Amino acid sequence: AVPFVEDWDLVQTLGEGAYGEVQLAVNRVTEEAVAVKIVDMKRCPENIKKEICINKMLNHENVVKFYGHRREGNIQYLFLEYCSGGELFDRIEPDIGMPEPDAQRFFHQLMAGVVYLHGIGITHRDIKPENLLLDERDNLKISDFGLATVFRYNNRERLLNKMCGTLPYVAPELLKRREFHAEPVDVWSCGIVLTAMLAGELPWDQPSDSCQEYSDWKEKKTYLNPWKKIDSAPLALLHKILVENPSARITIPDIKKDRWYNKPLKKGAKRP
Ligand SMILES: N#Cc1ccc2c(-c3cc4cc(CN5CCC(CN)CC5)ccc4[nH]3)n[nH]c2c1
Question: What is the active site of this protein?
């Protein structure tokens, strides 16, 4: 009905990437803001097609909302939820981290999103601060499903084998075994994100015996650089998440029962 509702203006560039760029778009009439992921297909047909399919089946408060997409020649346009607060990455002070109560709150929200995804059979495969966005009220939302895939269909689990992710956040089994369960891998990456939030640094370049940092952790030398800055309660949770054997690694239902996870720390928003 309203004559100019379909027109959007490109205000600025939110972030560039290998496949393309994401820009802020504002509705001409309503001034509603949305992020537009512009991926130049000419440079991937297979990748982007799957990303749209996965986005179409997602609906959760801790997952970046999908509004739709447009073909238009050889350029895909993904209309997504605009998260005013930016990336979690920018809330992590180098070598410091952030206040423990804020990290706990962000972690709770991250667990909520991951539980949702896993419940519908999808694994993200690239969880890291750069892909965890914040809205106006600092609510965390999982974004970028370009590397995501379905690991459970018709109630039957499919073991994964493709090398996906970012080295500092990837689980050790991804580098050691041919096949592996999807869920423990996302749990591990959430553990590395927690470490980053509480220490402002990544523990190792990759989870392999060759990395001195990784071997030290296995030998329980928690008096070293990253771990010494954390505090026993959350550190005990990390000891359960960053376990090399994925079969022995803590599951999300048990993380929800962890002492630190349920420790009162935060305070609500001043004057709601
Ligand atoms: N999939 C996906 C997907 C990727 C990114 C985004 C964003 C996004 C990125 C971003 C970056 C900054 C911080 N910047 C903005 C740019 C400015 C320079 N022009 C410097 C400060 C502030 C707000 C903000 N919001 N919202 N939704 C999605 C979905």
Answer: 126 (proton acceptor)
